[PDB]
Nucleic acid binder design. Structure first.
Lengths: 130, 108, 52, 74, 177
RNA sequence: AUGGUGAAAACCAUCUAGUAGCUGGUUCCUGCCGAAGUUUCCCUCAGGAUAGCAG
RNA sequence: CACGGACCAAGGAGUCUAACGUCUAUGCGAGUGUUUGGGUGUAAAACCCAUACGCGUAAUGAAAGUGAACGUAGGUUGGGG
RNA sequence: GUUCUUUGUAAAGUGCCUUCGAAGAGUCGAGUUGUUUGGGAAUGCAGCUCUAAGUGGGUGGUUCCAUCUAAAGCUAA
RNA sequence: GUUUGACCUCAAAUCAGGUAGGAGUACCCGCUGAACUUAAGCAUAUCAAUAAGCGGAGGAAAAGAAACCAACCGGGAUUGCCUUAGUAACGGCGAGUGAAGCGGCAAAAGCUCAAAUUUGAAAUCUGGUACCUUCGGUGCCCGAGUUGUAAUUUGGAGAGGG
């Protein structure tokens, strides 16, 4: 070759890259419980059977719980705004619990929300307050 | 004249590709849960094979939603139709069994 | 490049060959003829304990 | 075709509105006169030659019949 | 809104209203250059349904081509050479003469920061779309390449040279078939 | 033929290892067997279709 | 007749592949073929294999069909043994 | 893993009930002159002439039935 | 108002910020296109939807989420491999040319516009400039933009409310 002949001849050197070992021994990255329980001497499919978890959901072409309990372990384990709360205080002190009067009201209930909207927000308000 | 000298090479290529996908998609099983489908044409109708994707109907009957189905790794097809009754039953049972097996991790 | 490099074999014939090859390992005279200084070995076929 | 292509009051309105505001094309200008003089028979002949198929020319001459009848009376 | 009325108005092309607009514009476009920039698209409904937003970075070049290879693709190719920084998106017919045909080809500036942002159009900034018209990757180019789906397009679906090279070169495996 | 360079009809590079009803040449030993010189139509002229002789 | 040979060293010409057969050997046998692939591996080797497909296994016809025991799957004559 | 901040009558999702509900034209197609193919139902494309429809339109199967929704665009392996 | 002012259009500049050319070219995408050679002379078949030439890209490209294939107890984006198969089919049936659906596998991922009003408030963006924790954020000014920029929707429907 023309260009390769110069690169071998020059005193610049070549951008030598040794990256063939890393193409096989790939570290697991996305789960810490797996990161501890993964034998790199074994293959992909062999590591899955060792754990318990399925490696393939289809019937595979060709031929052929210590860890899974720890995954079930990690499976065992919103408020309202200041204006919204203060606005609900105005409605409750005015009417009480008359939602029909509350939604036919114009001065306090400006955005013409339904009975179901106002009462739901009042239930959340009655949890944080009286 | 092409020669496939790389038959051994490309199997090692494909295996390492699956190995990377295993490393990156750590707890998940590399591929999506595909349906069970009856093949077309008089010659092949006795054969029952892996289909592309389920349906909105099969997904809805299983007890989950279409957009959510894809996030849990169920392949969903929208152009496929549920004409046969036996195929419909077999796929619904396949999903319900799959839903008993899955362990969906929390987002916290 | 497109010379026939690899050879297709019958899978059964290939299995026959390995069975024959295994059978010939337990003969002792056949092993001596093949090479292998096996005069001072206790018995054939030689089996060592699993702790090896 | 569950979503085949229902009537849609708006689309019908727009099509008929444009149908009059645009006026008439030269072949149609000839065609409507050809209906009143030479009859619907020869009108379908000229329309079939002008357009592609006869199935187009039927609905075309039928549309011209609707235009002429609605114009003079109402 | 109006785009339904315009859509239907553009159907009746030889009708009295649109006939008159043709004979005025055909004279006006002959006064101007072969390849020149229109400030706004004359058929804006068509511009939209071919992917034109009236924001900074979109350009509508008007182009003139001779009559009697395809003319739509030649129109796009001519503006590609003149406006090299731009990327051809789509083109459409506006007006024609006995001697010439006119197209209003729409372009996008990939260099303009209003396009490098929004994700609906930032795909055109990717270097794989340099001269889409010079490779027949536009609407009219893909049309002339015979690329659709069906029995009709069997010999020219995924590259007519690709299917030829596949069919007329011998393939041999390690363990021969 | 394609593409190019030169010039008071040319050359260079590829297609092209172009196509031969042919010319010249074809690389170790020994043993054993061993011809034919032609029948009949495809018409023959060319190439063969067959029988004969040697396995 | 003629064509080749001044001499010497080295180089130098029935090869490789595909398609289709011939015979012989090997494997198995109404079946047979792992090697497109997948699994595995001391890593282009070797070792395993799913579903299919290839060819063969049951014929007689031209559009439409039918289907092989009167039977020690025959009676005789021969016929290696 | 470790924290610092999360707000706004904010952003969605799901089931039921009620009222509506627009989808690309000098394009589809038609005749013809060339190109494309081994293409028999000019396949595909281009040139030129004319040029549609909305309980629509394209493609196939023996009188219906099945199948998609062109004439806009993006996208890894 | 015989002034003046809106726009639209055409200009301008050694202004500010950019960008396009050329090289490489095995692969890919377009465009253009011979002849020696094969059937007997050569118009097709045939060299050949080749070579040369021209234009354009990238790490791949192209293709792609059906206006698809089918005729079945239906499949379901695209690409590639195995097979279908040297089959259908075409070819002075001859040199011969030569698919495709199904099936097995490799790899798998879907979505964005245009479409009917934000109309109780262009909710959007460019640029300049001042700072900041600078592949950017914020304030302020300017321009674009109603000949429609944002949010909401793309038939798998969807939206309005309850």
């Amino acid at each position: 070759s023309v260009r390769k002949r110069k690169m071998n001849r020059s005193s610049v050197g070549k951008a030598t890259r040794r990256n063939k070992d890393k193409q096989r021994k790939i570290n697991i990255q996305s789960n810490p419980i797996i990161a501890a329980n993964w034998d790199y001497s074994l293959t992909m499919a062999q590591n899955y059977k060792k754990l318990g978890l399925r490696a393939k959901l289809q019937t595979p072409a060709g031929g052929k719980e210590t860890e899974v309990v720890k995954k079930l372990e990690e499976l065992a384990s919103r408020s309202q705004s200041e204006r919204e709360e203060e606005w609900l205080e105005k409605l409750y002190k005015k009417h009480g619990d008359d939602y029909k009067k509350m939604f036919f009201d114009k001065k306090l209930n400006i955005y013409q929300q339904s009975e179901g909207d106002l009462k739901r927000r009042l239930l959340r308000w009655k949890k944080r307050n009286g | 004249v092409k020669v496939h000298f790389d038959q051994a090479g490309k199997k090692v290529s494909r295996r390492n590709a699956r190995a990377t996908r295993a490393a990156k998609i750590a707890p998940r099983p590399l591929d999506l849960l595909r349906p069970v489908v009856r093949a077309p044409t008089v010659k092949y109708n006795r054969k029952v094979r892996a289909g592309r994707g389920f349906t909105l109907a099969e997904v809805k009957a299983a007890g989950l939603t279409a957009a959510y189905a894809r996030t849990i790794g169920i392949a969903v097809d929208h152009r496929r139709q549920n004409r046969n009754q036996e195929i419909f039953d077999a796929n619904v049972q396949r999903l319900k069994e799959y839903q008993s097996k899955i362990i969906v991790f929390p987002r916290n | 490049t497109w010379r026939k490099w690899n050879v297709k074999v019958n899978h059964n014939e290939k299995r026959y060959a390995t069975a024959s090859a295994i059978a010939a390992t337990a003969v002792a005279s056949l092993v001596l003829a093949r090479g292998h200084r096996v005069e001072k070995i206790p018995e054939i076929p030689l089996v060592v304990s699993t702790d090896l | 075709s569950y979503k085949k292509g229902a009537a849609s009051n708006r689309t019908k309105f727009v099509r008929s509105l444009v149908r009059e505001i645009a006026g008439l094309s030269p072949y149609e200008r000839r065609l409507i006169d050809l209906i009143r003089n030479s009859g619907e028979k020869r009108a379908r002949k000229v329309a079939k030659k002008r357009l592609g198929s006869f199935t187009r020319a039927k609905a075309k001459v039928e549309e011209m019949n609707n235009i002429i009848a609605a114009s003079r009376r109402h | 809104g109006a785009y339904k009325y315009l859509e239907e108005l553009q159907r009746k092309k030889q009708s009295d209203v649109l006939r008159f607009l043709q004979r005025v514009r055909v004279w006006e476009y002959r006064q101007k250059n072969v390849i020149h920039r229109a400030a706004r698209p004359t058929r804006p409904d068509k511009a939209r349904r071919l992917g034109y937003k009236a924001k900074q970075g979109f350009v509508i070049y008007r182009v003139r081509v001779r009559r009697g290879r395809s003319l739509r693709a030649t129109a796009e190719e001519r503006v590609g050479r003149r406006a090299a920084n731009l990327r051809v998106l789509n083109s459409y017919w506006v007006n024609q003469d006995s001697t010439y045909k006119y197209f209003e080809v729409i372009l996008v500036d990939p260099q303009h920061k209003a396009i490098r942002r929004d994700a609906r159009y930032n795909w055109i900034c990717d270097p794989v779309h340099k001269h889409r018209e010079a490779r027949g990757l536009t609407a009219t180019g893909k049309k002339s390449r015979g690329i659709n789906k069906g029995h009709k397009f069997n010999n020219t679906k995924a590259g007519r040279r690709k299917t030829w090279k596949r069919q007329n070169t011998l393939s041999l495996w390690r363990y021969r078939k």
